[PDB]
């Protein structure tokens, strides 16, 4: 396989024909005011130690990301990538001053790229011959900031299909975005085919290593845009240059189950089955209808694994840049605590003498999948907090396996290990 750069005559026609949805707006087209401001913001944020490598999970393997990052965006919003839920350090939509200033900066960058994107989608629709679709597909709600110093890596991976050389980030799609939403990137480089010293973004068509890929050079302050279905039909990578580089990748996160407000509302829904006169250990339930119980235990898992464990796995490295999620995480944890009491109550009702076995088996069938999953995921999370590489990470932001309590701890109604309880309930349902 081979690739094209501006050095090739075919590059330009290839781009115009097979990539009308990829746009480049060079540093020139953006005000020097903005450049200085966002570059300063990157640099303060780096100096404050705000960007972290993530301890992600891909195809069974625990991996540190070579790139270090921080998520910034709408308050209460989250972005899930490579099985890791990033929580926004918030920007001032309708903290240590400096850090708050940088977030405001990236908010205005966001406004600018949003305008540019709408503009480009308008021109794109015009060449193809509804403005709600356009504005929603450009309504960026977060940006994921990236940093890599390539001299810090002992050995970089070779781009395997087209000879593009060294890769900072492998071929992928930006995942979990609103359908056909655009992606806008501000690239900031600290400065026989593609020049190894310059950073490039690479592109290929999915499934296809015969059509030569493109490597677009990125100089300081250059911006690129992926429009409409480009991010789905094509893969992209990042090709390392000689110097360090920052980037700001503004996206429309699909967040329909990804906001604080959403998960709080799910918790409230589970707790509608609970007599709520008073908050004590005496949890009593309004109903034991299978469908209501299933839902409650499903929500129990949702808040526990998508929110609590995800959050605390990141070693609380937010209080380094914000405390916005502190009380929300305390509130969710308490809501999850009550839900522990709920599961206990359901177990108590199952073991109760005087319950017709038909109603007992109706309940078991409703909750077994949830308690099973709660066991399996709890093991995964516990392993993932010990493991090989979790060893190394600085104790100042190393994975905490929260919530966690010992067998001896009697502030909690149930044990962390549910294996006994799962076997016992699975046996009863087979009792013929
Ligand atoms: N240790 C690593 C962990 C993750 C990735 C990586 C990927 C590695 C493999 C892959 O198929 C997709 C990847 O997508 C990424 C997206 C990001 O925003 C950041 C990193 C990746 C990589 C990589 O780029 O090869 C290495
Ligand atoms: O930095 C870029 O240009 C693309 C962003 C990216 O691939 C990433 O790190 O998620
Ligand atoms: Mn990317």
Q: What is the separation of C-alpha 350 from the centre of its chain, rounded to a whole number of angstroms?
A: 38
Instruction: State whether 51 and 192 are in the same domain.
Output: yes
CB 143 within 8 A of CB 51: no
Q: Which of 54, 65, 174 to mutate to test the pocket of ligand 1 (most atoms within 8 A of CB)?
A: 65
Terminal CA-CA length for the chain: 63
CB 219 within 8 A of CB 27: yes
- Written as one string, the DSSP assignment of 123-190 is HHHHH---HHHHHHHT---EEEEEEE-GGGSS-PEEPTTT---EEEEEEE---SB-TT--EEEEEEE-
Question: Sign of the CA dihedral 380, 383, 389, 392?
Answer: positive
Instruction: State whether 146 and 273 are in the same domain.
Output: no
Task: Tell me the CA–centroid distance for residue 160 and ligand 3, in Å.
Answer: 18
Instruction: State whether 310 and 335 are in the same domain.
Output: yes
- Written as one string, the DSSP assignment of 290-310 is HHHHHHHHHHHHIIIIIIIHH
The total of structural domains in the chain comes to 2
Instruction: State whether 268 and 227 are in the same domain.
Output: no
* Contact 83 CB / ligand 1 (< 6 Å): no
Question: Cβ of 386: how many Cβ atoms within 10 Å?
Answer: 10
* Contact 185 CB / ligand 1 (< 6 Å): no
Last residue of one domain, picked from the residues 240, 259, 278: 259
Instruction: State whether 384 and 341 are in the same domain.
Output: yes
Instruction: State whether 148 and 31 are in the same domain.
Output: yes
Query: Could you give the CA distance from residue 252 to residue 121 in angstroms, rounded to a whole number?
Result: 15
Instruction: State whether 168 and 239 are in the same domain.
Output: yes
- Resolution expressed in Å: 2.5
Report how this structure was experimentally obtained.
Answer: X-ray
CB 247 within 8 A of CB 201: no
Query: Could you give the CA distance from residue 331 to residue 58 in angstroms, rounded to a whole number?
Result: 30
Domain assignment of residue 276, yes or no: yes
Instruction: State whether 98 and 145 are in the same domain.
Output: yes
Domain extent at residue 15: 3-259
Domain assignment of residue 111, yes or no: yes
Nearest ligand, CA 170 = 1
Instruction: State whether 92 and 228 are in the same domain.
Output: yes
| CATH number, residue 378 | 1.20.58.1470
| CATH number, residue 155 | 2.60.120.590
Tokens of 59: 């195809």
Q: Which of 23, 42, 56, 67 to mutate to test the pocket of ligand 2 (most atoms within 8 A of CB)?
A: 67
Interrupted backbone of the chain, residues before each interruption (C–N > 2.5 Å): 94, 129, 191
Which residues contribute to the annotated binding site for Fe cation?
A: 172, 174, 236
């Amino acid at each position: 396989g081979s690739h094209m750069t501006p050095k090739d005559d075919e590059f330009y026609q290839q781009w115009q024909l097979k990539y009308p949805k990829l746009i480049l707006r060079e540093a020139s087209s953006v005000s020097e005011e903005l450049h200085k401001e966002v570059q300063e913001a990157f640099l303060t944020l780096h100096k404050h130690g705000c960007l972290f490598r993530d301890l992600v999970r891909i195809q069974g393997k625990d991996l540190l990301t070579p790139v270090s990052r921080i998520l910034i965006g709408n308050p209460g919003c989250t972005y899930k990538y490579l099985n890791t839920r990033l929580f926004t350090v918030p920007w001032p939509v309708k903290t240590e001053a400096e850090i708050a200033a940088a977030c405001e900066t990236f908010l205005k960058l966001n406004d600018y790229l949003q305008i540019e994107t709408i503009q480009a989608l308008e021109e794109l629709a015009a060449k193809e011959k509804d403005e709600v679709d356009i504005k929603s597909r450009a309504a960026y709600n977060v940006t994921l900031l990236n940093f890599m110093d390539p001299q810090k890596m002992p050995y970089l991976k070779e781009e395997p299909y087209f000879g593009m050389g060294k890769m900072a980030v492998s071929w992928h799609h930006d995942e979990n975005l609103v359908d056909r939403s655009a992606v806008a990137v501000y690239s900031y480089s600290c400065e026989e085919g593609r020049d190894p010293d310059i950073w490039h973004v690479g592109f290929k068509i999915s499934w296809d290593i015969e059509t030569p890929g493109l490597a677009i050079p990125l100089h300081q302050g250059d911006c690129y845009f992926m429009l409409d279905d480009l991010n789905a039909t094509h893969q992209h990578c990042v090709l390392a240059g000689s110097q360090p580089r920052f980037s700001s990748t503004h996206r429309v996160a699909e967040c329909s189950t990804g906001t604080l407000d959403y998960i709080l509302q799910r918790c409230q829904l589970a707790l509608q089955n609970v007599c709520d006169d008073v908050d004590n250990d005496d949890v009593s339930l309004k109903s034991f209808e299978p469908a209501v119980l299933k839902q409650g235990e499903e929500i129990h898992n949702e808040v526990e694994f998508e929110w609590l464990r995800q959050f605390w796995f990141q070693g609380n490295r937010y209080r380094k840049c914000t405390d916005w999620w502190c009380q929300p995480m305390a509130q969710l944890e308490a809501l999850w605590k009550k839900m522990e009491g709920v599961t206990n109550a359901v177990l108590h009702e199952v073991k109760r003498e005087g319950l017709p076995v038909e109603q007992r088996n109706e309940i078991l069938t409703a909750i077994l999948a949830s308690l099973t999953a709660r066991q399996n995921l709890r093991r995964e999370w516990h392993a993932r907090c010990q493991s090989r590489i979790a060893r190394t990470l600085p104790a100042d932001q190393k994975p905490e396996c929260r919530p966690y309590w010992e067998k001896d701890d009697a502030s909690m109604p149930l044990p962390f290990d549910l294996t006994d309880i799962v076997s016992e309930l699975r046996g009863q349902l087979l009792e013929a």
